[PDB]
């Protein structure tokens, strides 16, 4: 689709970056975002950093947005998806963190679709 191709191939503009900031702030404000606002502390999760190959959190993404790290929407989506995939990989499905990942990713998907639509 056009949105698929734009996501992979069209460099993020300054207008795109304002949209990414809005998406990120929406995630940070969500009631279920608190487990993901800052990196996992090793004291909450034995072996976390040996198990999880590419840790990610919303504060690291915020730093990257502010530094204009992302060149393509795909890269921003990849970092956000690491947050949820890492959480579901490390934790059992009855963990409250796993539950938060399910809800927050669903919200992200809604906001992401809105952002993609706005790029045209």
Answer yes or no whether residue 40 interacts with ligand YBV by CB under 6 A. Answer: yes
Report the residue number, 23 or 32, with the smaller CB distance to ligand YBV: 32
Q: How far apart, in whole angstroms, are the C-alpha atoms of residue 76 and residue 73? A: 5
Site stretch for ligand YBV (CB under 6 A), options 8-16, 19-27, 35-43, 58-66: 35-43
69 Cβ neighbours under 8 A, 6+ residues apart:
63, 75
- Using CB atoms within 10 Å of the CB of residue 73, give its burial: 0 to 12 exposed, 13 to 18 middle, 19+ buried: buried
Residue from 70, 76, 84, 97 that binds ligand YBV (CB under 6 A)? 97
Here's the x/- map for ligand YBV, 54-93, by CB under 6 A: it reads as: ---------------------------------x--xx--
Residue whose C-alpha is closest to residue 56's, from 10, 95, 70? 70
Query: Residue 113 to residues 23, 107, 116: CA-CA distances in angstroms?
Result: 11, 10, 5
Identity of the residue, 14 or 47, whose beta carbon is nearer to ligand YBV in the bound complex: 47
Residues within the interface to ligand YBV (CB under 6 A): 35-36, 38, 40, 44-45, 87, 90-91, 97
């Amino acid at each position: 689709s056009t949105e698929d191709a734009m996501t992979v191939l069209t460099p993020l503009t300054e207008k795109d970056y304002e949209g990414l900031k809005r998406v990120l702030r929406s995630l940070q404000a969500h009631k279920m975002a608190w487990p993901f606002l800052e990196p996992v502390d090793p004291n909450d999760a034995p072996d976390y950093y040996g198990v999880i190959k590419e840790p990610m959190d919303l504060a690291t993404m915020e730093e990257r947005v502010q530094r204009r790290y992302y060149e393509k929407l795909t890269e921003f989506v990849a970092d956000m998806t690491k947050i949820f995939d890492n959480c579901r990989y490390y934790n059992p499905s009855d963990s409250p963190f796993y539950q938060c990942a399910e809800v927050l990713e669903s919200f992200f998907v809604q906001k992401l679709k809105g952002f993609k639509a706005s790029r045209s």
